[PDB]
Amino acid sequence: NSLLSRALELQRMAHELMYLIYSDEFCRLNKEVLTRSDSLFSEQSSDIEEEGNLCLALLMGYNATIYDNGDKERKKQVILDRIYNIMSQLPASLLKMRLLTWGYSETYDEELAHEAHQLIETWNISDLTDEQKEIIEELRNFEENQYPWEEVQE
Ligand SMILES: [Ca+2]
Numbered sequence: 775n776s777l778l779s780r781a782l783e784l785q786r787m788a789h790e791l792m793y794l795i796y797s798d799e800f801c802r803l804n805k806e807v808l809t810r811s812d813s814l815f816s817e818q819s820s821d822i823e824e825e826g827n828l829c830l831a832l833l834m835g836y837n838a839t840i841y842d843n844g845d846k847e848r849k850k851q852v853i854l855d856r857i858y859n860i861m862s863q864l865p866a867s868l869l870k871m872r873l874l875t876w877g878y879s880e881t882y883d884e885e886l887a888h889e890a891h892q893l894i895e896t897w898n899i900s901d902l903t904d905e906q907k908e909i910i911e912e913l914r915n916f917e918e919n920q921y922p923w924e925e926v927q928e
């Protein structure tokens with residue numbers, strides 16, 4: 775039940791929720807992701823890898839849950855600020871790719887997309903992992919859906 779265990783659990787649950795109408799279970803799962811995000815939000819870590827995993831869990835958690843108490847947008851900016859403070863120190867990894875992609879989705883900071891495409895270029899097109907394929911798809915969807923007013927007219 776460590777900070778890291780909690781963060782990895784939240785990353786997994788937030789992913790589960792996003793890759794899945796208002797049933798008791800649907801509400802329970804959305805509520806649990808909010809509850810877990812709220813519990814972890816006040817935690818601070820000096821270790822950059824632990825801090826990266828905490829931030830990624832929180833950004834994923836608050837984006838996954840339908841619930842918003844009116845303070846979620848403010849809390850996401852606190853998390854983004856924590857990510858910008860460690861991004862340059864993180865080594866190339868799946869974690870760093872996920873933080874760049876989720877951070878870009880919240881900011882549309884072209885420097886984050888640029889760095890995310892450079893990380894992609896380091897992988898093997900002939901043998902991408904299941905997670906690499908998924909995060910590439912997620913990044914492309916954020917890039918294509920920046921502006922709702924640009925949606926194809928039909
Ligand atoms: Ca701490």
Ligand SMILES: [Ca+2]
Nearest residue numbers: 837847879880
């Ligand atoms: Ca948003």
